[PDB]
Amino acid sequence: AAQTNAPWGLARISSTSPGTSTYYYDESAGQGSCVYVIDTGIEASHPEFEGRAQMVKTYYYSSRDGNGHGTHCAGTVGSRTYGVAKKTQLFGVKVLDDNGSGQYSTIIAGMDFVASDKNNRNCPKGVVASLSLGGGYSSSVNSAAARLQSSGVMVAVAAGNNNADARNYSPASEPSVCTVGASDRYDRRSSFSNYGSVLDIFGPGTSILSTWIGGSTRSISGTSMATPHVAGLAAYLMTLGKTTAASACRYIADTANKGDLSNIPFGTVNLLAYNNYQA
Ligand SMILES: [Ca+2]
């Protein structure tokens, strides 16, 4: 399959070079897999989701995304125009309020919910979790991400937008999960993107165009935008039978584009997400 005039993000994860605008992917496109978006909720009624998105848990007065961040992350995972896996199932777990903030206890409880709610969903191809949040370091948040990873879910987390080492940020410091850095369309490390030895993969993070709330679309930046790229890629590689939950982050790093990113600090992996699809 080929999507012309696609955002630079998906075209990059399907290219060995920058500057292309065509996303190439296998027509399975994530069918049979599930991706849990743990954010500010998902506007499920957006036509770009085609009835594949739904709110399964909220810790507040409403499950509706009053912010747009969670809807933007879900659009990068599996929207019809801005998604990696255009056929996957999106489950919204609203652990952040409409202000984007959230207590660590609520966010931890959201991860434990996904570790058990996946037993209630139909995901024969695999379960992925997109954690496009994070804050200061916390062993409880790190253990909550490791528990979700040990339960059989591919956990992709954001490295953070502090331009520092991701070792002082949770769940970015958890070594068992996939810590995703950000990159721009010119194969440079995003100026805000965190780094360090704990990072596993870089993804398109700067000027990522995806869906917004109210049936609209907009372009934003952040490692919160590169995480759904890897999350959608893990679900894409899952239905194709290339990898499993405990080995997707390791497989993505193995088949990634090596030595193509600039401004990568010493000791940080120079890996960019690449679906390796040969049309
Ligand atoms: Ca890791």
PDB file of N, CA and C and ligand atoms in Angstrom, residues 174-179 198-200 249, ligand 1:
ATOM      1  N   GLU A 174      12.740   3.512  32.808  1.00  0.00           N
ATOM      2  CA  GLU A 174      12.534   2.072  32.924  1.00  0.00           C
ATOM      3  C   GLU A 174      13.247   1.352  31.786  1.00  0.00           C
ATOM      4  N   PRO A 175      14.201   0.460  32.072  1.00  0.00           N
ATOM      5  CA  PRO A 175      14.947  -0.187  30.980  1.00  0.00           C
ATOM      6  C   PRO A 175      14.162  -1.261  30.246  1.00  0.00           C
ATOM      7  N   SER A 176      13.105  -1.812  30.845  1.00  0.00           N
ATOM      8  CA  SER A 176      12.361  -2.888  30.200  1.00  0.00           C
ATOM      9  C   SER A 176      11.407  -2.391  29.123  1.00  0.00           C
ATOM     10  N   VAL A 177      11.081  -1.098  29.110  1.00  0.00           N
ATOM     11  CA  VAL A 177      10.146  -0.554  28.131  1.00  0.00           C
ATOM     12  C   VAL A 177      10.915   0.129  27.008  1.00  0.00           C
ATOM     13  N   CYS A 178      10.189   0.662  26.027  1.00  0.00           N
ATOM     14  CA  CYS A 178      10.783   1.307  24.861  1.00  0.00           C
ATOM     15  C   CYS A 178      10.729   2.820  25.049  1.00  0.00           C
ATOM     16  N   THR A 179      11.888   3.428  25.284  1.00  0.00           N
ATOM     17  CA  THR A 179      11.998   4.876  25.417  1.00  0.00           C
ATOM     18  C   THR A 179      12.282   5.474  24.043  1.00  0.00           C
ATOM     19  N   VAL A 198      19.591   5.096  28.160  1.00  0.00           N
ATOM     20  CA  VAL A 198      18.323   4.398  28.346  1.00  0.00           C
ATOM     21  C   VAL A 198      17.433   4.478  27.111  1.00  0.00           C
ATOM     22  N   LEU A 199      17.713   5.398  26.191  1.00  0.00           N
ATOM     23  CA  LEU A 199      16.910   5.515  24.983  1.00  0.00           C
ATOM     24  C   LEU A 199      17.133   4.313  24.074  1.00  0.00           C
ATOM     25  N   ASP A 200      16.070   3.899  23.387  1.00  0.00           N
ATOM     26  CA  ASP A 200      16.112   2.734  22.514  1.00  0.00           C
ATOM     27  C   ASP A 200      15.929   3.060  21.041  1.00  0.00           C
ATOM     28  N   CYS A 249      10.515  -3.960  20.858  1.00  0.00           N
ATOM     29  CA  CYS A 249      11.457  -2.857  21.022  1.00  0.00           C
ATOM     30  C   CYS A 249      12.863  -3.269  20.604  1.00  0.00           C
TER      31      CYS A 249
HETATM   32 CA    CA B   1      14.907  -0.203  27.115  1.00  0.00          CA
END
